[PDB]
Amino acid sequence: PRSLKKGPFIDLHLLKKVEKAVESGDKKPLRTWSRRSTIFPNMIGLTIAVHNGRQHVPVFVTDEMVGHKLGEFAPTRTYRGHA
Amino acid sequence: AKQSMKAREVKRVALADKYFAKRAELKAIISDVNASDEDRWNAVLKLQTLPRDSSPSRQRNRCRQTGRPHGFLRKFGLSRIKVREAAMRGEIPGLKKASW
Amino acid sequence: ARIAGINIPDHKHAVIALTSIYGVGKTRSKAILAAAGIAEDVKISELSEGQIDTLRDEVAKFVVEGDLRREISMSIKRLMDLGCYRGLRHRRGLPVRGQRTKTNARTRKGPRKPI
Amino acid sequence: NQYYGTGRRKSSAARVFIKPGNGKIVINQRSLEQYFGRETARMVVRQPLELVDMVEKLDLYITVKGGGISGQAGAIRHGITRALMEYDESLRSELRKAGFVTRDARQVERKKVGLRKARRRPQFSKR
Amino acid sequence: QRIRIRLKAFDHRLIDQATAEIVETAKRTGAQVRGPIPLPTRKERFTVLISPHVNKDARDQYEIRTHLRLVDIVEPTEKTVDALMRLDLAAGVDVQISL
Amino acid sequence: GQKVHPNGIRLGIVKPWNSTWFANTKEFADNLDSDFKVRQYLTKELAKASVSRIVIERPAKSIRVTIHTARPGIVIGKKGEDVEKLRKVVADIAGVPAQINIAEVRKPELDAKLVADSITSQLERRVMFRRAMKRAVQNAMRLGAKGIKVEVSGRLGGAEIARTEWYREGRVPLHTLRADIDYNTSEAHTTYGVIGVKVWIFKGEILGGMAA
Amino acid sequence: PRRRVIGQRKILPDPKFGSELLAKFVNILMVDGKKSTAESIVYSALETLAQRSGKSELEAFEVALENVRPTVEVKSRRVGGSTYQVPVEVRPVRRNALAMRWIVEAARKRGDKSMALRLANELSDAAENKGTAVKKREDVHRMAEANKAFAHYRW
RNA sequence: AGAACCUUACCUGGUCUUGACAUCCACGGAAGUUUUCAGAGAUGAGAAUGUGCCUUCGGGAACCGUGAGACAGGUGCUGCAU
RNA sequence: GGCCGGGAACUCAAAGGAGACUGCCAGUGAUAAACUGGAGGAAGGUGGGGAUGACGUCAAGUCAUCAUGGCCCUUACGACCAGGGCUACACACGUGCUACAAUGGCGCAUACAAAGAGAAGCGACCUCGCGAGAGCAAGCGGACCUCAUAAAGUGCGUCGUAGUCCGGAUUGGAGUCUGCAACUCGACUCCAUGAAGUCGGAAUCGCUAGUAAUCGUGGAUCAGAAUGCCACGGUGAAUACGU
Ligand SMILES: [K+]
Ligand SMILES: [Mg+2]
Ligand SMILES: [Mg+2]
Ligand SMILES: [Mg+2]
Numbered sequence A: 001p002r003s004l005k006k007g008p009f010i011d012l013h014l015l016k017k018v019e020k021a022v023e024s025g026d027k028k029p030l031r032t033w034s035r036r037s038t039i040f041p042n043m044i045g046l047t048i049a050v051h052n053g054r055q056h057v058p059v060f061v062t063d064e065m066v067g068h069k070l071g072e073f074a075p076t077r078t079y080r081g082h083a
Numbered sequence B: 001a002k003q004s005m006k007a008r009e010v011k012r013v014a015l016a017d018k019y020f021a022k023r024a025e026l027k028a029i030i031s032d033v034n035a036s037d038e039d040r041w042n043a044v045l046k047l048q049t050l051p052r053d054s055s056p057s058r059q060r061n062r063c064r065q066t067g068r069p070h071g072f073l074r075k076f077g078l079s080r081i082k083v084r085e086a087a088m089r090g091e092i093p094g095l096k097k098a099s100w
Numbered sequence C: 001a002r003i004a005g006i007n008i009p010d011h012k013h014a015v016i017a018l019t020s021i022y023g024v025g026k027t028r029s030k031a032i033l034a035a036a037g038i039a040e041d042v043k044i045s046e047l048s049e050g051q052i053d054t055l056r057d058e059v060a061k062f063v064v065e066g067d068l069r070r071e072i073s074m075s076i077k078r079l080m081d082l083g084c085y086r087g088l089r090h091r092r093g094l095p096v097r098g099q100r101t102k103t104n105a106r107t108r109k110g111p112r113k114p115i
Numbered sequence D: 001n002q003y004y005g006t007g008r009r010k011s012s013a014a015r016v017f018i019k020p021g022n023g024k025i026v027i028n029q030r031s032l033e034q035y036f037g038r039e040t041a042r043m044v045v046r047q048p049l050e051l052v053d054m055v056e057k058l059d060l061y062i063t064v065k066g067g068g069i070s071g072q073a074g075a076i077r078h079g080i081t082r083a084l085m086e087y088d089e090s091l092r093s094e095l096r097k098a099g100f101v102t103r104d105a106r107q108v109e110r111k112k113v114g115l116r117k118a119r120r121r122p123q124f125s126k127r
Numbered sequence E: 001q002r003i004r005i006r007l008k009a010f011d012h013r014l015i016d017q018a019t020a021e022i023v024e025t026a027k028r029t030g031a032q033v034r035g036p037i038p039l040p041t042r043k044e045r046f047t048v049l050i051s052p053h054v055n056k057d058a059r060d061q062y063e064i065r066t067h068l069r070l071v072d073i074v075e076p077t078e079k080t081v082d083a084l085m086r087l088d089l090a091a092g093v094d095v096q097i098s099l
Numbered sequence F: 001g002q003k004v005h006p007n008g009i010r011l012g013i014v015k016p017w018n019s020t021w022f023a024n025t026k027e028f029a030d031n032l033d034s035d036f037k038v039r040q041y042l043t044k045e046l047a048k049a050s051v052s053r054i055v056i057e058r059p060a061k062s063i064r065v066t067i068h069t070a071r072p073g074i075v076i077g078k079k080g081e082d083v084e085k086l087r088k089v090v091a092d093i094a095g096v097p098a099q100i101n102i103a104e105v106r107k108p109e110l111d112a113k114l115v116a117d118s119i120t121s122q123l124e125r126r127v128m129f130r131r132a133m134k135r136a137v138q139n140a141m142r143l144g145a146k147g148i149k150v151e152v153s154g155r156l157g158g159a160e161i162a163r164t165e166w167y168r169e170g171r172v173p174l175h176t177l178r179a180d181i182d183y184n185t186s187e188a189h190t191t192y193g194v195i196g197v198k199v200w201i202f203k204g205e206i207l208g209g210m211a212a
Numbered sequence G: 001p002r003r004r005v006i007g008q009r010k011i012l013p014d015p016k017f018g019s020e021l022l023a024k025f026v027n028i029l030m031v032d033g034k035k036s037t038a039e040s041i042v043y044s045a046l047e048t049l050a051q052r053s054g055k056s057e058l059e060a061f062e063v064a065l066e067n068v069r070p071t072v073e074v075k076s077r078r079v080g081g082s083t084y085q086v087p088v089e090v091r092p093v094r095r096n097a098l099a100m101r102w103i104v105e106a107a108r109k110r111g112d113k114s115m116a117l118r119l120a121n122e123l124s125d126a127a128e129n130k131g132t133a134v135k136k137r138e139d140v141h142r143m144a145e146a147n148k149a150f151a152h153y154r155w
Numbered sequence H: 001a002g003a004a005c006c007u008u009a010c011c012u013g014g015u016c017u018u019g020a021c022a023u024c025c026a027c028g029g030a031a032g033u034u035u036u037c038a039g040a041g042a043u044g045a046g047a048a049u050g051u052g053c054c055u056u057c058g059g060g061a062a063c064c065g066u067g068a069g070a071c072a073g074g075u076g077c078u079g080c081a082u
Numbered sequence I: 001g002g003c004c005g006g007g008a009a010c011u012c013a014a015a016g017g018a019g020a021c022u023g024c025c026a027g028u029g030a031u032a033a034a035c036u037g038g039a040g041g042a043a044g045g046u047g048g049g050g051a052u053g054a055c056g057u058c059a060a061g062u063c064a065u066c067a068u069g070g071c072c073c074u075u076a077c078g079a080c081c082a083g084g085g086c087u088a089c090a091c092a093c094g095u096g097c098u099a100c101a102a103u104g105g106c107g108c109a110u111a112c113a114a115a116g117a118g119a120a121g122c123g124a125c126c127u128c129g130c131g132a133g134a135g136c137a138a139g140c141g142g143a144c145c146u147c148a149u150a151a152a153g154u155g156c157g158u159c160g161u162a163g164u165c166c167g168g169a170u171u172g173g174a175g176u177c178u179g180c181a182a183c184u185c186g187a188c189u190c191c192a193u194g195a196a197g198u199c200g201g202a203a204u205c206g207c208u209a210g211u212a213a214u215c216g217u218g219g220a221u222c223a224g225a226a227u228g229c230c231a232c233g234g235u236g237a238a239u240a241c242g243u
């Protein structure tokens, strides 16, 4: 994981777009490609449509997701068994 | 390789040479333990907004005659095939076939 | 000897005898023995009940045995109920930390299942 | 005076100085038992001073570099043999018949292309 | 003070020519040298796949031998230093002078 | 099977290098790229001027390029007006003061680059490959060569299946490392594809080594 | 092999007793080039054997070698659609080799604590004419005395 | 002789059409530098700053952008044409 | 403290030579080539090892290093960007690595290498951190300085044959570093976890000596990312009657 001396990582476009959303009370899904951004406690209550490769999976943010990247809740590979 | 890939490598080298100094001081005040937390944080945001192709880590060493991204040698600046060709033609000084 | 809730092997030396607790390995046992002031080479059967009592009393600050099993289950259950990537790997029994599954996932996947 | 020999074995080089004396042996500012804990290494150090029957007649001052234990001990043996030949020169026939005048020319064979070692081929599968 | 000349080349014959040329120069002019010390030569080896595709057990082993010779002048008079950096050495020879 | 390159296996024995400069690791790739650029420019510029070997030396803050050619009159020009402009383009391509020396080969049928270049130009001019190889072979054996081998490969005469044909007279002792075998290669670009020409010329064994 | 004849490699006699026989036995017992630990195993096993037996180390080791040393072994030969085990008298150097390898393999198959204790027990059982190595000699001699007719014809 | 991005040739989606990489013609600007907004970024809209070198007095060289077509480009196929 | 004055002997370094040729001797042979043995010699018959690959074979491999005939695309099969994939996983195979232990595991102390690398780099010493590592910062474009106190070994102790103080897979928590960025999908550290495995069916591989076996070390590629490859030493066997 990333060092604690360098802080957590969040993409600016998302950080500014979720500050705008939490400032204006936006309930539309936050459309993003930034799967590398750590979830901050100001996304709590919003749904983030995180990319996974071919569509934006919407993930509603709860208290337990804080400190996880956005991409952990968007599975990229599809697998439904072999036989 | 493709001419587009050689152009990509040239553009990444040029962007790294253009933005080398300010990213270096940005990383210095990010990794500085005596810096303030808001300063480190705004420097992380500034490193984010700086172009990605300006990062020396995005350069792939290519052969300077063909553009080959594999089999590179840093001493000759060439891929292994062109190194063998120029070594056999004697265009590399001091390089001969070894045995011990 | 009965430290925490389980039985410590009496015939062995203290360090290994204490490592028989879910939550105490070799260096945590060494730390327990060094804070108790007992040699690690002495058998547990050859030391007094007051030494047993202080060994229990400073094992007790380490969350161990069933409390640790509760904490580990709760962390894995939190991952699975949350439904992240680590949660889905725990749910499907696949390796969680990025190992290969084309070959050699045998510890996580159990024995071989022929088609 | 100080009769000199150079011995070499594998990667080891041994400078041996022979002085007519009591029977002391010093290797790298240490005794033979202090430097060579291997008793077979001590045996091959004392090997050229066994057929000449001069074990307690010379003082041995030895500086050795490179190689490991048995390589250093063999280089020390070759240096003792050379320096004994410099000191007397009639011990040449006995040391030759024992086989100590010959420098053992066996070096580590080089690791080659396509082999895992000097000669060890990787495991072969027809199919 | 003393003049330290380090001589680097890929071939030993023209580096001997260069070292003999500078010790003659400094022995012709008023100075004396401390003979040329042959310092360990660097054999930088390279192993290169010779096939354009596959064939991993087919490789050429190349080597550059970088010979180095060091020459001392213990008393640098006022003309031998000017003759040193006025002297013309071979093309494939690197001459480093430190004061 | 596959034969070793006879110039590269003899480098440092009887064959000298085409580049005789020193560099550290810091300047080596830059110097090799500069040498490649000036050799590519000089080959493209003097393709019609019969150049055999371009030897590059790089002394202290200078470059000296020796062009061994068979036609030094058209290489130099009228009052050297051309070799001056070559020196100018070589200087602003290498990035350092340049000097260009012109060496003349006296037997252009004994140098393997000129022989293979003549065979290539004849193959692009559509002469029969047997006639071209037999001429080159007979010219070298007549003018002194202790031996010659000429090998020509790939869609010979516009055939749909590529062949390799070779002629050889005299000794071409390719395993003798002291043997002065000059070897070079050329490529004809015909309308049916690429025809590869390899020429070996043996000029007698060298006794003495690199000092000779 | 086919053409070349092999010169004999000189082995150094062991430093405690001066015995090339015990040197070969160390090398036979050696593993991954650890001759020191091999020499320590044979020295401790020879010390405890000698204390147990009473006589000297080289005499008790030699009497153990005289009790596993075979004189006739069976080679496998294919004759048609059947196999004949043909008896052949063996050379003294193979007698010593086969004896020392059978001692080493039997003491490796034993179940004592250390290798020196295993080897001392095997040498003591060899001196007392019993155990796995002596049983291997008796099995080899039983096969040879069973199939002696094949060797008879072969000569 | 080393796939997190890059490499990368593959997929999804957003984009460009003389083009990412050249030479040639015409026109206009020295290039360069700092900075704002929107966008995932590609990109688009700006703001402020700079106007250098050599001739000659007419313009050039470097570099950028626009427009047209010669083309550029292809890790597309055939190693059973080479 | 080669630490200092010193010395040029030695080790060593790297140039030049010498030496090994069946050269000498004795038998066998067809008055031959040659074979066998011996002496001398450091090396003896090709001293050891490498480089070196004949005419051709397999329409063998590579059009994706490059070049190239022809064919195909040209607001797309070209170009740019973000995210994903190349890392998937009922299974099958090849090549490795680590083991199943006592010729060992562990703890303390201690001995002996060879080759190599280094300036957008190798980075001491000191301080802090359990550690990965951080801060300050010397030297070094290097026989100087750094990477970098080699490990197996040896000595003492302990474990006592148990799925164990063997083994170290997997997983949870806490971290470090590099990089814009470590979720997919990095290496490493700590603490806890402690999986299979007790020597492997038919079958099959390597190797004739400094070899096999094992034990560490370095390099290229490389911001980071080796159990792979390339190279380097330490210890160091067994066996070849014979075709
Ligand atoms: K081909
Ligand atoms: Mg890279
Ligand atoms: Mg080795
Ligand atoms: Mg990618």
Ligand SMILES: [Mg+2]
Binding pocket: H079, I059
């Ligand atoms: Mg083919």
Ligand SMILES: [Mg+2]
Binding pocket: I044
């Ligand atoms: Mg002889």
Ligand SMILES: [Mg+2]
Binding pocket: F175
């Ligand atoms: Mg030959």
Ligand SMILES: [Mg+2]
Binding pocket: I059
């Ligand atoms: Mg084919």
Ligand SMILES: [Mg+2]
Binding pocket: none
């Ligand atoms: Mg991409």
Ligand SMILES: [Mg+2]
Binding pocket: none
């Ligand atoms: Mg022990």
Ligand SMILES: [Mg+2]
Binding pocket: none
């Ligand atoms: Mg363990």
Ligand SMILES: [Mg+2]
Binding pocket: E042
């Ligand atoms: Mg170096």
Ligand SMILES: [Mg+2]
Binding pocket: none
């Ligand atoms: Mg089990």
